[PDB]
Amino acid sequence: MATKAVCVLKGDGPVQGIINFEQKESNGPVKVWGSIKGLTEGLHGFHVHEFGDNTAGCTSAGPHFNPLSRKHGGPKDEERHVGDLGNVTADKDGVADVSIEDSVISLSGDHCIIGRTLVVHEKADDLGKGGNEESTKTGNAGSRLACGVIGIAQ
Template sequence: MQDKAIALQPPLTWMDDSQRETGMFQVTTPPGGCPAQTQTARELPAFLCPAGEVLLLGSQVRERSLKSWRGARLAMPALLCASLLLVACALAASADQVQQQMGSNTEEQIRDMHAKVTEIWQEMMQRQAAAIDPDAALHAVCRVLPSATLEAEQPRVSGLVLFRQLRPGALLEAFFHLEGFPNEPNGTSRAIHVHQFGDLSQGCDSTGPHYNPMSVLHPQHPGDFGNFAVRDGQVWKYRSNLAASLTGPHSIAGRAVVVHAGEDDLGRGGNQASLENGNAGRRLACCVVGLCGPGPWAHQAQENAERKKRRRESECKAV
């Protein structure tokens, strides 16, 4: 079996001149770089070496902070990818032995490794954000795409989920803007939850169960966001006081947000599945939560305010 050549350090480039002033970077992966998806248990988790992920540092970043970030970013992804490369090569070289000795435990152990590396990555990102501006709010973005395993007749849901946490320990805020739902009577609802793994190698099916670090029953999980009303094929909703966090040992950064085909029964379904996932049905679409700067949130907040204004004006005209 021939080993894959993996670039340990993707280049960091400015997105364009207009975004240079706001401190917006984009990480890109060259041909032959970190794998774009995980196809077997022997390859690396996709989100750990992201291609095209955006990291916004905000408009108030000083030159010395930029120098500090440039130095730190050379070490962090290289160290992480190098460690994972060694593990992946070891697994590939002894694949037959591993399968004979460990059997069905192989996948479980790799998922454990995935979870541990995720925690390391989260901690590194949080420390870097704190070093740049310890008083700044944390933001995250999740670009929702249809699951790769959907049948042709299933709806193709896409959109954006944005998060903001004003300080560590504060409750989370979120914007949900999704479209592509089937044309059904207004008032139908869809469940949205955070799932354990940021692994989209098999569409949304590989994101694992609900993220449940405290081993509690549904709907007590930190990412149990509940049901969202669909109107005219869209979900457009702002929610506050969410129990999830972008910081600390139970951060949802690097984990998946999943949009379901059904409604969450909120643990009242009378069966075991209800206490695990709310019987929310098929996974239609998903994304991986990634830390970002304040730009996307500010843009969405302005758009939301304008939308509310247009709605009020429309209601006044109707009266």
């Protein structure tokens, strides 16, 4: 069973990064860390999308991974998509040194995110609190700057 995964995020602009995942036990959290560069300073939505399909770049990854058909939320919310990892923050150099721990995604089982797509977005995810229709779907995080398929790692 997988205890590590990795994702190489690429896109058509300056955004690119490598993100690691580790889950030492299948009943425990997944640690998510890595570095993405090229980002405008501040918050960027950071989500696992349903499909690991990059045939049309980031668009073919589909919507946020949402096997329980919930509304969009922030990672601390009970009402959230499985793929709702919230925001990552880039510094004044444009670098996001990601450090997230999440207990809803998994590397095995029904919430398994291996073979799905991680996407870093153009804007802040409002964590489902924006009061418009879009907030309940995407958090108003805007376009997909860079993405990659989440793969099993050694």
